[PDB]
């Protein structure tokens, strides 16, 4: 959830 945000970001 933070990845998409942290990995993926945005
Ligand atoms: C927040 O929603 C985290 C989800 C980010 C997507 C990860 C999907 C892939 C999961 C398998 C990778 C190995 C598991 C740690």
Short mmCIF file of N, CA and C and ligand atoms in Angstrom, two decimals:
data_model
loop_
_atom_site.label_atom_id
_atom_site.label_comp_id
_atom_site.label_asym_id
_atom_site.label_seq_id
_atom_site.Cartn_x
_atom_site.Cartn_y
_atom_site.Cartn_z
N UNK A 1 0.86 -1.22 0.00
CA UNK A 1 0.00 0.00 0.00
C UNK A 1 0.88 1.25 0.00
N UNK A 2 2.09 1.13 0.48
CA UNK A 2 3.01 2.30 0.51
C UNK A 2 3.97 2.23 -0.68
N UNK A 3 4.06 1.08 -1.27
CA UNK A 3 4.86 0.70 -2.41
C UNK A 3 4.43 1.24 -3.76
N UNK A 4 3.24 0.83 -4.02
CA UNK A 4 2.43 1.23 -5.11
C UNK A 4 2.64 2.67 -5.11
N UNK A 5 3.15 2.85 -3.99
CA UNK A 5 3.51 4.04 -3.40
C UNK A 5 4.99 4.10 -3.14
N UNK A 6 5.57 3.02 -2.74
CA UNK A 6 7.00 3.04 -2.50
C UNK A 6 7.76 2.37 -3.66
N UNK A 7 7.13 1.50 -4.45
CA UNK A 7 7.80 0.78 -5.48
C UNK A 7 7.47 1.38 -6.80
N UNK A 8 6.23 1.25 -6.90
CA UNK A 8 5.36 1.62 -7.94
C UNK A 8 5.24 3.11 -7.82
N UNK A 9 5.20 3.54 -6.57
CA UNK A 9 5.08 5.01 -6.34
C UNK A 9 3.84 5.53 -7.06
N UNK A 10 3.25 6.59 -6.56
CA UNK A 10 2.03 7.14 -7.22
C UNK A 10 1.03 6.01 -7.44
C1 LIG B 1 0.45 -2.31 -0.58
O1 LIG B 1 -0.63 -2.36 -1.13
C2 LIG B 1 1.52 -3.38 -0.84
C3 LIG B 1 1.15 -4.20 -2.09
C4 LIG B 1 2.15 -3.90 -3.22
C5 LIG B 1 1.99 -4.92 -4.34
C6 LIG B 1 2.76 -6.20 -4.01
C7 LIG B 1 2.17 -7.37 -4.81
C8 LIG B 1 3.22 -8.46 -4.98
C9 LIG B 1 3.33 -9.28 -3.69
C10 LIG B 1 4.30 -10.44 -3.90
C11 LIG B 1 5.75 -9.96 -3.71
C12 LIG B 1 6.40 -10.74 -2.56
C13 LIG B 1 5.57 -10.57 -1.28
C14 LIG B 1 6.42 -9.87 -0.22
#
